Symmetry: C5
Subunit: 257 residues, 5 copies
């Protein structure tokens, strides 16, 4: 009847896994104008995503009856919020002219989004500057045209790979995702204090208007997120994205479809 | 029950399918109220569309009249993901050191949408009545001192896309019996933008009598403005940045008295 | 069950039908409490109106619910009209727009709003045009039960001298929010979908004495800062829709 | 029901019926913790009153007695209107230009109130234990370093108006079984004050068991502190400003075992 | 029903009962990640206690609800005690008071709080007094399922190195809020009227194994800034009220 799965998604802020700056981007470089804009690889965050294999049910061959895992609810937590109490690790100081005070810690933009679905997250391509040339490592629509600075119904994608779809080029497509629930919050600024909450007591119902949760096609549960907590500012004023990992607990029930 | 999905692209000032689509031109500021003539492209206008619904009645004088009734909607600001871009030609956090991220989009948020069975009914109201609007804009000319506050003579309806200045027109609470409108303004120029998005939020459009907007001429009228803040260049020139809005409207065929 | 719709224009200080309607005159600041004399037009006053209801008067019109909206929020997207620039040294950027304190209050009642006199500085000399308690004394800086008024005139009771009296107003509902500061971003919402019930703990709405519906408000949105750094209050008008029913009293 | 209405004037430091009633004296700041001595009038104290309720004439020897039960209250901060004053001898926004409004009251908000059937029970706790409070103030003298956090030995009761320093005493959560208290602190020195007022908000005072405060000796105990922020003079001297608080308490006669 | 009331004092770094109890030592900042070594007393640690409940034996104590309050919020109205002044150039104005980051977390359970190790900089060398995973590797900058602990001691698990483990804690409820920055206005509320239900989705509260009730918290209120601009963590104590019932388990 009921199964719980638990999973994590580590952030993909830009710096490679299992090296000293895992969880961070490379230092951000800023172009002089829109026509000379080519953000280098490692300097911008990408979406995290994973497909969790569920116990065989939809692909069970003992019945012609179609059964699917239905995600009825979830808990999700940003993990490692504790680490942001660190104001000693090589941070620009509050009173930098006097070489005094705490580090300024992680400050600036928060972008927190997650999606839970029975198929890959469907994406709309949309960029601040269409003339940005994304690097070879990134999955983007090349030469997308001026229409990609707002909504263009031709510019679609699917979140099919971890750590390569730039956050700044792709977002959830509200014209699709009938079998996914997604949630996002953006708080801008470069000196904004991060605001994060964590608890193991908060449940999100995933049922739609008709009382139906995401249905897991091919016995796959699709988890996606981005958790930009803000910027790390070094003594030399170089700034990098810092990300945190996301916990998922999804409650599923066997459903006759 | 029929569901329609639609988008409204922002009309921040720069023309469609040119390099600054989604932005205004750089804002110039007048020395005084007497010599205040904002050039075309430097200010945002409302977005609006009439969606053609399936044609119902052969004749509007009939003993039984069918109309499409909007009973609920979902709406999302799209492209919030793009505001994670702090590399595209933005004034830097530490401009004196030529270092840090771009400051990103900051400042005023103006977010409003309306769903109705006829054009949005507007009240004309301006900061400075002596402002001279350009030929491209729809405004009340020589509105007089009274137009700085409420004057019951200064009415209009949102009959055209991309030409009614946001700073000159607002929703008329004396009218709009057949439209639901919702707005939030956060002011300032360095204010952090706060935006949320989800495919899970439904707004019921039924009034206190249990009646939704009724679509006159089988037209569904969608209106919005989504100013997310200002883009600041290295040379400190500032432009409005806007985002497109998604609408999902659930309609039922209703017999109407 | 009849519906009334009304507007109250703001009374920020500058005269009606002239170029600065909706604004105060530029704010001057005293050197000390003793010499403090805010000139007429440099401070906002309460807006009020009595709406005449259909003759009834035993029966009385009972206000059961209302909608209220701050109108013209749209105009605050104007950052071009003679405003101090974001980068004033560089002579560049948008205007800073309207910023600073927000004071939003409305009242709906069956008689004039009952007021408590209370001032920041008791030694302030208000102008002849303003309705105040003259020489109110030091007790007027906090609560003094002797210092009462009623909001009987539009555009003359200073906001900074009079507030709603919680010891009275048994036949009025009032609601207020203050956000201070001089650089604070204004935050305003508008919708035609929000209804406030005016029934009290016993299921009785304001009862309209003499078939009068009394509307009051103040809507300070913030300050307008000119290039020369002179600052004025900016206000917005308020919409009221009040649903009344005939009640046997 | 029986309704009681009362006010508590603030006790910010400056004496009643003199020109600075509602204000503290200008705040001085110690060079170090060891020599810290906040002078009388430079810091706020709690306001408190006992209201005599109608006598119930009860045999305190018998099995059944009547007590006044506080079932609900309305409370309002009064005089919020006065904070629209930016002309009264305030540091100007553009002090270098001798131009702009006064900066008005800004900085810390501390709003607390208590309603009980006996005096408010206090826990002594201070920022700096080596502070020497003046003779006029009720404190625990030489409290020791444990007074900077929780020390179960350091108790008090709020038995006098205007002499218990807000900065040395708070509500004791280990007691106060017969009192309801509510507090909010917003810190900073340039923080915008945020206050609401309405005659339409009721707070229920019944506990988990459906019992409100029971008025011992037919006495209703009201306590508050309402620091709205600081007044800053042209010469940058800063003082606390407080506002008075209104109480409306609904009481019923209760049969008590 | 039985009620427990208890307090936990903060562990901001300075030793108990000395003049700076409730504060950290002044925070020093490394030049780089490789040489990063936060000295003992300059960082906050978790507070924890085990409450020994009355012997029952089978029955177990079940925590069904709680109230919790941050105590001493009143003290933050102090702007006179050796604080950097608002107008330091004029040597005038109040103290700036406590400003900056708020980290508020509490946990109530029937066994020790289960922890996930996670650090800003894996190359930080923690002092001997602290309980950490030594040389934890680059993976410890994000989630590594190998890097686990349990909150077994008061005032030694660094806040910046351990957080509640969402993959465990089936028998504990935990709640946290972080507001960052260094000049942020602190926002704190207190009341004796707010109850939190501790029952899970099946109507079962934490069950107290070996009749032990486990309380854990951290309450960083912000930074104290001296005239000389040296900055220290300031913390506040937390009150717990836990409502318990006897439950037949076997
Ligand atoms: C709120 C207030 O008291 N405003 C004063 C105003 C200010 O005090 C002044 O602008 C600050 O420098 O001053 C006013 O004019 C004053 C004259 O009446 C007086 O004779 O001379 C004063 C200078 O010594 C000052 O010019 C004003 O600007 O209107 C009076 C107003 O009440
Ligand atoms: C909070 C506190 O300890 N306040 C002191 C105050 C401050 O220490 C002082 O303002 C910081 O400069 O000092 C007070 O007494 C002063 C003497 O300490 C000083 O030597 O002489 C001053 C007169 O020039 C002054 O009298 C004060 O300012 O009142 C005493 C207070 O407790
Ligand atoms: C977090 C950290 O690594 N702090 C180290 C600091 C800082 O590097 C310097 O104070 C910056 O100049 O230097 C020490 O000599 C010190 O002052 O005790 C050793 C300490 O371990
Ligand atoms: Mg099958
Ligand atoms: Mg669709
Ligand atoms: Mg109407
Ligand atoms: Mg107790
Ligand atoms: Mg588990």
């Amino acid at each position: 009847s009921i199964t719980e799965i638990e999973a994590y998604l580590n952030p993909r802020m830009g710096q490679p896994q299992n090296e000293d700056f895992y969880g961070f981007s490379d230092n951000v470089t800023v172009s002089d104008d829109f026509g000379s804009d080519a953000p280098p690889w490692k300097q911008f965050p990408c979406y995290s995503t994973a497909r969790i294999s569920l116990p065989m049910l939809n692909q069970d061959m003992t019945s012609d009856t179609i059964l699917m895992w239905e995600a009825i609810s979830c808990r999700t937590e940003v993990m490692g919020v504790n680490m942001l109490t660190n104001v000693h690790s090589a941070q620009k100081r509050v009173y930098e002219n006097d070489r005094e005070g705490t580090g300024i810690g992680v400050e600036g933009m928060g972008y927190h989004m997650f999606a839970i679905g029975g198929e890959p997250l469907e994406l709309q391509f949309m960029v601040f500057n269409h003339r940005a040339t994304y690097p070879a490592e990134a999955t983007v629509i090349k030469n997308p045209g001026a229409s990609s600075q707002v909504f263009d119904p031709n510019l679609k994608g699917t979140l099919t790979a971890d750590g390569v779809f730039p956050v700044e080029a792709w977002g959830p497509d509200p014209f699709k995702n009938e079998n996914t629930r997604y949630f996002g919050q953006y708080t801008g600024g470069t000196q904004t204090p991060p605001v994060l909450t964590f608890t193991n007591t908060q449940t999100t119902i995933l049922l739609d208007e008709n009382g139906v949760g995401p249905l897991c096609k091919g016995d796959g549960l699709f988890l996606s997120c981005a958790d930009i907590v803000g910027f790390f500012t070094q003594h030399n004023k170089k700034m990098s994205f810092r990300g945190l990992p996301r916990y998922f607990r999804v409650t599923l029930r066997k459903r006759v479809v």
